[PDB]
From Swiss-Prot, chain B:
Domain comment as written in the entry: The ankyrin-repeat region is necessary for ATP-dependent protein disaggregase activity. It plays an important role in stabilizing the substrate-bound homododecamer by mediating contacts between the two homohexamers.
UniProt KW Signal keyword: no
Protein's organism: Homo sapiens (Human)
Record-given protein name: Mitochondrial disaggregase
Keyword Oxidoreductase: no
ANK repeats: from-to residues: 2-31, 35-64, 68-98, 101-130
Residues of the full protein shown: 132 to 673 of 707
Membrane-crossing residue ranges in chain numbering: none
Family: Belongs to the ClpA/ClpB family.
């Protein structure tokens, strides 16, 4: 504890020797004084450029929070010393950091070298971040990330990626959220695509992905879950759940899984959300989510979508459907979703088509790779197969389930055999299996 | 503290040098002395005309609140100095401002130049306000302001403008608030017109415009949100949300958006609100909002209104009638159950589906918006041939209205723009012109811009 006080006193007195001795002895570089200032901070206010430099080289943090709450950069600007401001900025100081009073390094000092340094640091940071992010996106676009997991559905991936890129590059109106409606048969990756998109946007934030299941909303009064009860009713003080989640992460990705299962008057609450990204809870607080992304998944027109997809498979063949027939898909949606204004607010309608033979083979290969890696990681068993296995597994495909049919087929026909053999201790650790078309 | 006291003493002592030095240092000009007066106050009371002038030049407020609570104009009047009163009035002092005891500068003053200055200031304020407001309204009418943002809907613009202008010029009954109901198909500017009207009435004040998404009132019990819970119930200490909002701005513009999505027993709360502008919160406090403007929006009769736009198809040479409004009524009563609710609305405004020229105008407006955004953000100049709008309008969907055009333009132009921008094929200051095929191509001032490949 004495080391921190000694370092603070040395920094206040501009004692280079004492500051260096304390730092080399393990003294807290960001030591805090009882008055609320640190060694780097009091060095900054006292125009101790050398002390500030040595403290920064020792690991001083200039962004740590009357001048109460003013950081090291704030005090450097207060002294109107440009050398200290430049050194702190080179050390990672934020030129726009704020104190308890809200003052910033860009306000304390008069126009001059300090302002120039702060502005240049801010501009260079912003430009570097912009260029780096753009280059990263170019190098590894969203489409490749989705293709890592999603198989087929090229049109849907292209549409979603185009919309997302248009949003990220700033070429989007901020007055209206972006809304998607995923349509297609069951078990073809709609909610999977939504999950992948949410992960891409908010990879390191669970709060960034808000999931709803509209099976849990199959009656009119279920709207009270979204915004909570009005004043004087049970649960009022709680407030809306969806409103809470949106307030936590305004730019999150909201997924209304199986929206078709909602009562139609539950969708009415979505009008303001989809138009202006505005929603009011039971307490009257209004949530602004203009930059959020809304995804709705349903299979309302599944049969018609499959029939259309046959168009590609109806070709004389001597892949991409124009799908102007959406004019006759609209009546189905209107019949289910009874309000035209609801559909009008949807930016894009994404159609997922049934898998082709090659896509089915790819799915089977994906499943067998997953199982092989699981076996290697768990029991250290190598697992291998040929075309005959993929084709035999595909032959058991069911249209009504898609990827789920493939999963069940692989599990039943192959995984059961691996489990039975393992339980019989016929699989020594490190051994290799070929599935030599093990059938019938 | 020390600087404020020094400035106050200098103002009291008529010390020009001290007052100037303290003002230059940064002493608060409106600092309050322990006796209740400020620097300007005591400069006025001591007949320090020059000190009053210099304090006003420094930013002194003459209208700031036995001379307890007296304002600088009050002190100048009490000093019997006409110069101080004149200078304070020139600084915006109110001749009718009241002190703690309720005496105005026109009261304490002795007959003379003080009366002249105060009365001249008051009359000038009133007449200048009236004349300037009238001149601005005539020069730039609300109807011309709306036309900048709303395409078509001439009959709605004309009705709303006529009612608004009627209210502003005082030719309205103050007992009953003005109520509008907006009817028509989806995405044809109802809420847009409401927003523009609110912005016009209250230039920027957020409290001047009140939103209410009636879609959140699908059950009777939700009406409690208007007025709050009764005594003894959770949330009672908070009053009615709408009551609070209206109290903060009695003459606000209230928008009950999607009123047809409310439970019809919830609309019952609006009977007194629309008839007399009275609403009593859960705590028994009544809100007076007789001068507010209420706007409702719905698409209740929208098939029947859009079907009556077959009058555009009648081509007699080769707009809604009273008798149509008596076919649109049965539909209104079937939805909004009560004749006493409908009989409270001042005007029913009908918004019609766009004709082909209005679609072209909408497409041009959207393209102009995007061009302005591009030019401002990246200095990119954007141009389009006349045929671009013709191609784009084909994406129009009568069921969705303008937002269909919005989405079409976005999807099939802005996507290419963003793809090119990310590809860095749009150098700053470059000129980009859209050309017309069955699809849309972009030329970078002459050569065709090569479409990037996201899939690589
Ligand atoms: N196109 C796909 N490519 C790879 N895996 C997929 C694909 N689609 C689905 N899956 C996987 O198969 C499962 C199906 O999940 P979903 O994606 O959620 O199905 P769903 O289409 O979304 O439709 P429902 O809710 O049954 S209607 C998931 O386990 C996915 O991981
Ligand atoms: N003349 C116009 N008519 C309709 N929309 C316009 C017009 N000019 C601009 N717009 C824009 O097109 C969109 C139309 O949406 P809204 O203003 O909400 O119309 P609406 O009458 O309220 O349709 P509903 O009942 O909510 S489905 C708005 O975002 C407007 O800004
Ligand atoms: Mg699903
Ligand atoms: Mg609307």
């Amino acid at each position: 504890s004495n080391k921190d006080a000694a370092l603070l006193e040395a920094a206040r007195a501009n004692n280079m020797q004492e500051v260096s001795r304390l730092l080399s002895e393990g003294a807290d570089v960001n030591a805090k004084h009882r008055l609320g200032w640190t060694a780097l901070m009091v060095a900054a206010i006292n125009r101790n450029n050398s002390v500030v430099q040595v403290l920064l080289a020792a690991g001083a943090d200039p962004n740590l929070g009357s001048f109460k709450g003013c950081t090291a950069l704030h005090y450097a600007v207060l002294a109107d010393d440009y050398r200290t401001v430049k050194e702190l900025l080179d050390g990672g100081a934020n030129p726009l950091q704020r104190n308890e009073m809200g003052h910033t390094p860009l306000d304390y000092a008069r126009e001059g070298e300090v302002m120039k340094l702060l502005r240049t640091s801010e501009a260079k940071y912003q430009e570097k971040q912009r260029k780096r992010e753009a280059e990263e996106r170019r190098r590894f676009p969203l489409e490749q990330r989705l293709k890592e997991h999603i198989i087929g559905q090229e049109s849907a991936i292209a549409t979603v990626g185009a919309a997302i890129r248009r949003k990220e590059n700033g070429w989007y109106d901020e007055e209206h959220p972006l809304v998607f409606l995923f349509l297609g048969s069951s078990g073809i990756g709609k909610t999977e695509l939504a999950k992948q998109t949410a992960k891409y946007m908010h990879k390191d934030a669970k709060k960034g992905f808000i999931r709803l299941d509209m099976s849990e909303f199959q009656e009119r009064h279920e709207v009270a879950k979204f915004i909570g009860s009005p004043p004087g009713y049970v649960g009022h003080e709680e407030g809306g759940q969806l409103t809470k989640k949106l307030k936590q992460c305004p730019n999150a990705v909201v997924l209304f899984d199986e929206v078709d299962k909602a009562h139609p008057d539950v969708l009415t609450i979505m009008l303001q959300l989809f138009d202006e990204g505005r929603l009011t809870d039971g307490k009257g607080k209004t949530i602004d989510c203009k930059d959020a992304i809304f995804i709705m998944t349903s299979n309302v027109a599944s049969d018609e979508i499959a029939q259309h997809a046959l168009q590609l498979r109806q070709e004389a063949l001597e892949t991409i459907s124009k799908n102007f027939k959406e004019n006759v898909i609209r009546p189905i949606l209107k019949a289910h979703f009874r309000r035209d204004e609801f559909l009008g607010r949807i930016n894009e309608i994404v159609y997922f088509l049934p898998f082709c033979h090659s896509e089915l083979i790819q799915l089977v290969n994906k499943e067998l790779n997953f199982w092989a890696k699981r076996a290697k990681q768990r029991h250290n068993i190598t697992l291998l197969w040929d075309r005959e296995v993929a084709d035999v597994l595909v032959d058991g495909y069911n249209v009504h389930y898609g990827a789920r049919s493939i999963k069940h087929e692989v599990e039943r026909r192959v995984v059961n055999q691996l489990a039975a053999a393992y339980e019989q201790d016929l699989l020594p650790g490190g051994c290799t299996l070929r599935i030599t078309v093990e059938d019938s």
